[model samples]
Target chain A: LEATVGQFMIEADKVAHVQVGNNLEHALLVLTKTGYTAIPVLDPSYRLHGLIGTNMIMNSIFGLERIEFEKLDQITVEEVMLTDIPRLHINDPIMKGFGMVINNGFVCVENDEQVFEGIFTRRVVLKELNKHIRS
Target chain B: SLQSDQLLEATVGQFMIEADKVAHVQVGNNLEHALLVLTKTGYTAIPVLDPSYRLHGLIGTNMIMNSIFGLERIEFEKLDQITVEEVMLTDIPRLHINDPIMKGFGMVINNGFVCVENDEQVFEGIFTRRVVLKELNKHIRSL
Candidate 1:
């Protein structure tokens, strides 16, 4: 039987994501402290606003935004997040997840309740594909 | 002299994170251990290495998560059964440290980041796409 992304994804419950209004400095701290390459940005309701990464935020800081820790403290992750993010439903076809992952590097999942469920990344998808090919 | 044009001409070496600075995992480690490293570092993937510090492969937490979840008897114990060597991506995309910024720039656009290697095939460091933009923006005012 073909596998679904939900079956192999890191559930939202176990994810250490961030919120939208979070300070850029704090968000960077959380990302650096957690050591995650990217993390989901959410609202108070846990709706995924988008995703943020160390590279995304840092590039904006050092490349786009001027000043070091000064303006970083005043800005929010919402300003730095990739707001136009691709998404998938919990029941969406596995191939849909695969397509998104290939282009976006990762795809976030949502449930019927409109809550962010988790993410299905390219590495995980490829790993499962490798298993199938070998089997 | 942080001139954008002159800086863009600099070798990747000026910004590349040296191999010694990279946090990597070794072959033969259990999936559990590797996953721990991935979570602690929060990287999409971690470089797999040998005793000599040569990069043997690259492994991602996503792979381990998927592998575990795909198992028939998925549980913590199943983690012990898998090894880093079994699932790492061996066909890694790498670039020479001495390569020009323009060359590395294109590679990053497609590969997200490029692994830095020297002529001796030694793992030097990484030149991430993020660092590339920062390198350029410092000099290019219009950008």
Candidate 2:
């Protein structure tokens, strides 16, 4: 495989994601639509907002132990999304991707404009490394 | 009484989300449809099963997203031609039904999630690091 920086990152627009300020319901819809456990919430211009997930939302609600979906519209993904994730530039080295995945399941990628470009996941990284190790 | 002492003795089975609570995909299912389910369910990882629903392994959306991004923009069309078994992780680290909570926590803290099964080799559910942490966090807040 002709592995390169762009060749690996899960591009932003290609994968379904939710907008930063969207309601929890809409975020859930995006999650449902993509089948992705967590989605990168982005701004209007594709800036990274944060990542949100079904588990995160459910726990936040189920954190109540037993409850309703509640006034979902009143709550936004930003309220429950993860913001302290790692970020990598589009041109960063593959080793960078490897390093990030150690503690994080995925690494958020950014372009020169600081725009959220894509993500590099640990599962994929491990598979690639595994292949390389065997080859 | 939700102290660290109490939690230290908690068994994984006591708090694990049951198998039925998890959303999963079958072996023969189309990747296109699978993507739809992942998006809809929004769980970062899901179980892959056979016709009988016995767990074969687990698949991560990030892994799927990785495949799409790796294909040089072929997810939309390539999805139709792929199968779940072709894309899932089979070298999964597993957990038994009777494993201790702390042990499960250690694995999940590193792997994000761990597969669970019975002595009969039947798939149970998953023990996600997120779930354990959430329960702990809730316990803290209840104080």
Candidate 3:
């Protein structure tokens, strides 16, 4: 049997993320400490809002001459985060995830209420497909 | 239930992004320049190359941010002071352009992108997970 996205996904508890209200400075710290290029953005209630990354944070404050670090503390992640990101349901078939993850590194799985469940990574999908082909 | 042989017949060169199109930074460049390039290009990480276009390592915001991270604040001033060679991740995996796509599946499973080089060991391009995933999607649907 093929695994559902929930079966192979990395749970939200194990994922590193920042809330919508967080400043770019705080967001940058979380991203740097975790060593992940980008992470899911959640609201105060843990609902999936979007994804934030170093690129977004950096672009928000990049000035004509240099990176405007002065504005880092003032800007919020909600203003700079990517809202039009790919998403999946917990019960989604692994095949649907393949189409979604083709353009994204990972797909965010959420409930009907939009509460973030976990992340389905390319590593998980590739690992499963690799096993299938080898078998 | 799947035909693995057809998928295994594919090569990395067929799907890799050419070297000229791949965003990259030089090892001699300062962290400031590297950060600018990364921001402008919208890539979280990119290959670091020498003057001869040989792969040296990878430079990303993680390395650049950590290098300037201070007790009180992010030390933006030090960006110009530090070089890419100081904090770049040098111990990285690579794939030859001639390698099979199955090999890329294993390699890109762990990394965002895999560096591809020719026989002469010069930087050629990158094999990204996105490309491999696209291939898997295509082959799976074809079945």
Candidate 4:
């Protein structure tokens, strides 16, 4: 049987994340601690808002003459997170997830209610493919 | 077994995103510029190249942020003072376009993306996990 995204996705509980209302400083801390380039942004209720990363936090505070570091504690992730990214339904075919991951390193998975479920990452897919090929 | 041969024979060149399309920063560029390039492009990390377009290292947001972290707080004022060459990851994985997919996957699986080079040692493009897996999905589904 063909696998679905739900079968291989990293569950939301295991995924590190920051909330939309989180300050950039807190977001940076989480990103650094987790060693993740980017992480999902969610609301208090766990609804997906967008994705935030060190790049977004740094870019938002960059100024003409200097980087305004003070703003890190003031600006929220919602101010700079990417909201237009592609998302996959948990039930999506693995092929569909593969196509989306072509442009995105990872695609967020949502349930039928549009609530965040997990993420389908290229790393996971590669491991599966590697195992398949060697078999 | 034939499918295994197909997997082994697939080369990185067939799926790599050409270097021209790959976003990058120069080794001499300051951290501020690297941050801007990475942010604007929305790529978490990118290749660091010398003026001649030869791969030097890799730079990413995490590296930049780590460089400026101070005991008190993030020292943002030093952004332009530091150059990519001083802080970028020097020991990075690389691949030739003609390399087999099996060899490339082992690297890309950990690093996410790898810089591709030509015989002349010039930066050619990027071999990314995303593109590799896309092709893998195609092959697996075909069987």
Q: Give lDDT: candidate 4, residue B136.
A: 68
lDDT of 4 at B15: 69
Residue A9, model 4, lDDT: 98
Question: Which of the CAPRI classes, incorrect, acceptable, medium or high, describes model 4?
Answer: medium
lDDT of 1 by residue, B1-143 (tens): 45554654678877887777777887888887776666555566768877666767788755664565422333446666888999888898877888877677656655656678777667788877556544543333333
Ranking by lDDT: 3, 4, 2, 1
- Please give the lDDT score for candidate 4: 0.85
TM-score of the A chain in model 3: 0.93
Best by DockQ: 3
lDDT of 2 by residue, B1-143 (tens): 45755875777777677788988888888776676666567666688878775778776654654555432322445666788888888888888878877677666645777878876657788887556545644553464
User: Total backbone clashes of model 2?
Assistant: 13
In candidate 3, position A37 carries an lDDT of 81
lDDT of 1 at A104: 66
Compose the digit string of candidate 4's lDDT tens values, residues A19-132. Answer: 777788899899987889889999877899899877677678878755688878988888889999999998888888877887787889999888999999988877776776
Point out where model 3 deviates above 4 Å: B1-5
DockQ-based CAPRI category assigned to the predicted complex of candidate 3? high
Q: Pick the candidate with the highest TM-score.
A: 3
| Residue range A1-135, candidate 2, lDDT tens digits | 335455688787676678876888677656755666777888889898788886676555542323224455667889989998888987777766665665566778888899888888765664564455335
**Residue B95 miss distance in model 4 (angstroms):** 0.8
Instruction: Give per-residue CA lDDT, model 1, range A5-122, as digits (tens).
Output: 6776778887878887778767766765575778899887989888887656545544332213345677778888888888888777676676566456678888898898888765
